[PDB]
């Protein structure tokens, strides 16, 4: 009887309106209206919807998008519910994964998968190169990475890194100590000691040539590439599992795996990417919402969820189902998923990281210095700050 609008994106609009199929055969009383909104037209809908005074009651949200929809007052506070609920403990979240949540000490959605990036690879290549285990430091990383490239000679890689992506250079920023943003996040801090570090390694290798000076449009095909031994890993999230499976040439099954990404000193952070799911503050049925969101964090149907479509549960308990926890290639992420760190909350953080992926793609081809990329990447940072940076100056903070 009680309709309850959910907005959702895409492939997992497709797959979760499955499930909400079993939510209503266990909630008669509620009606789960799943609409799937393409994610390039899902930004505008919503503001759009905003402002109409249209917004639905349950909608996933991309994890980054969040600090807009809060301080554009649109969302829910999420505290109240979790603390009532048996089913949503935060201590059984990955620490990072909840935190992409909380802005500004206030609790906004609830993770409902997540993504994050660490390497694909080929075993057999490894092998080759003289390795039974994968690195788990920078340096390990860089001596395996050498050997590799001495095997596989001059036209192949030991790495593929699309130059047009900026999720690798911002794994490795992400696993220094210093933050990316500084003072109140009003100011690019990527001329600090930690950015520099990240792009000193990420630059490395290419200019060693263990990774290919490439777009992904200038791939022909990544999982054919990688089966064709074009190169050895791939930096890359959990929906190419099934890809990687699918295409999985006959004499190679179990000849490739994943394997958490290294950090300086050890396995080290990652991105905390995906999505949660939020109740619009003008809902008029809440509790019916909550419910929803409840049911999608029990560990069993998150499972379900990972099995259809791949994406990485957000607690440790769906973790310890057998499910997942006898698959091989899952257990790289759910080791990864304890240390990935949330990018600073800002409402501009999207712009952020274009600015930088455009600066390190320079650097990887035109050679651009690291000085000089770094002091021009805060100069857009900065001035990408300047609205949020003058609000602070004029009120409080």
């Given at each position: 009887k009680t309709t309850v609008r959910f907005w959702a994106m895409g492939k997992e609009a497709?797959?979760?309106?499955?499930?909400?199929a079993d939510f209503e055969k266990q909630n008669p009383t509620i009606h789960v209206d799943v609409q799937n909104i393409p994610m390039t037209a899902a930004?505008?809908?919503l503001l759009t919807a905003f402002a109409a005074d249209g917004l639905p009651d349950v909608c996933q949200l991309?994890?980054?998008?969040?600090?807009?929809?809060?301080?554009?007052?649109?969302?829910?506070?999420?505290?109240?519910?979790?603390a009532r609920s048996k089913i949503v403990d935060p201590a059984d979240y990955f620490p990072g994964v909840w935190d992409t949540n909380l802005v500004d000490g206030t609790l906004y959605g609830v993770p409902w998968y997540v993504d994050t990036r660490l390497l694909f690879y080929r075993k057999d290549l490894l092998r080759e190169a003289g390795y039974s285990?994968?690195?788990?430091?920078?340096?390990?990383?860089?001596?395996?990475?050498?050997?590799?490239?001495r095997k596989v000679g001059p036209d192949r890689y030991a790495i593929l890194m699309p130059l047009n992506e900026f999720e690798q250079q911002l794994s490795f920023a992400l696993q220094q100590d210093d933050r990316l943003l500084r003072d109140h996040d009003n100011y690019g801090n990527f001329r600090g000691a930690g950015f520099r570090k990240a792009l000193g390694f990420y630059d490395n290798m290419y200019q060693q040539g263990w990774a290919p000076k490439v777009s992904e449009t200038q791939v022909s095909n990544v999982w054919y590439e990688f089966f064709n031994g074009y190169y050895a890993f791939?930096?890359?999230?959990?929906?190419?599992?099934?890809?990687?499976?699918?295409?999985?040439?006959?004499?190679?099954?179990?000849?490739?795996?994943?394997?958490?990404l290294p950090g300086p000193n050890g396995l080290g952070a990652g991105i905390a990417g995906g999505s949660s799911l939020v109740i619009f503050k003008s809902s008029q049925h809440k509790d019916a919402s909550w419910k929803l969101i409840e049911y999608l964090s029990q560990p069993q149907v998150q499972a379900r969820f990972h099995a259809i479509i791949g994406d990485l549960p957000p607690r440790r308990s769906t973790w310890k189902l057998p499910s997942l926890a006898n698959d091989a290639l899952?257990?790289?992420?759910?080791?990864?998923?304890?240390?990935?760190?949330?990018?600073?909350?800002?409402?501009?953080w999207e712009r952020i990281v274009q600015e930088m992926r455009l600066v390190t793609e320079r650097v990887v081809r035109g050679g651009q210095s690291h000085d000089a990329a770094v002091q021009e990447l805060d100069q857009r940072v900065d001035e990408i700050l300047a609205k949020r940076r003058w609000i602070f100056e004029q009120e409080g903070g």
């Amino acid at each position: 009887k009680t309709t309850v609008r959910f907005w959702a994106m895409g492939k997992e609009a497709e797959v979760v309106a499955e499930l909400v199929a079993d939510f209503e055969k266990q909630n008669p009383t509620i009606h789960v209206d799943v609409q799937n909104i393409p994610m390039t037209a899902a930004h505008e809908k919503l503001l759009t919807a905003f402002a109409a005074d249209g917004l639905p009651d349950v909608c996933q949200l991309g994890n980054t998008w969040l600090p807009e929809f809060a301080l554009l007052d649109t969302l829910e506070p999420m505290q109240p519910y979790v603390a009532r609920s048996k089913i949503v403990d935060p201590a059984d979240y990955f620490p990072g994964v909840w935190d992409t949540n909380l802005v500004d000490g206030t609790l906004y959605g609830v993770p409902w998968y997540v993504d994050t990036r660490l390497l694909f690879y080929r075993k057999d290549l490894l092998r080759e190169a003289g390795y039974s285990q994968m690195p788990k430091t920078w340096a390990e990383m860089e001596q395996v990475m050498a050997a590799i490239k001495r095997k596989v000679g001059p036209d192949r890689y030991a790495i593929l890194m699309p130059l047009n992506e900026f999720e690798q250079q911002l794994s490795f920023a992400l696993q220094q100590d210093d933050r990316l943003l500084r003072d109140h996040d009003n100011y690019g801090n990527f001329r600090g000691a930690g950015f520099r570090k990240a792009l000193g390694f990420y630059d490395n290798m290419y200019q060693q040539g263990w990774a290919p000076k490439v777009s992904e449009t200038q791939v022909s095909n990544v999982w054919y590439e990688f089966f064709n031994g074009y190169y050895a890993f791939y930096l890359s999230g959990p929906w190419n599992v099934r890809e990687f499976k699918l295409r999985q040439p006959p004499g190679m099954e179990g000849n490739w795996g994943t394997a958490p990404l290294p950090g300086p000193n050890g396995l080290g952070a990652g991105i905390a990417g995906g999505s949660s799911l939020v109740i619009f503050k003008s809902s008029q049925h809440k509790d019916a919402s909550w419910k929803l969101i409840e049911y999608l964090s029990q560990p069993q149907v998150q499972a379900r969820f990972h099995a259809i479509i791949g994406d990485l549960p957000p607690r440790r308990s769906t973790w310890k189902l057998p499910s997942l926890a006898n698959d091989a290639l899952a257990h790289a992420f759910g080791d990864q998923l304890e240390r990935v760190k949330a990018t600073p909350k800002v409402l501009e953080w999207e712009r952020i990281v274009q600015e930088m992926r455009l600066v390190t793609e320079r650097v990887v081809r035109g050679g651009q210095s690291h000085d000089a990329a770094v002091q021009e990447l805060d100069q857009r940072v900065d001035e990408i700050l300047a609205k949020r940076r003058w609000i602070f100056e004029q009120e409080g903070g």
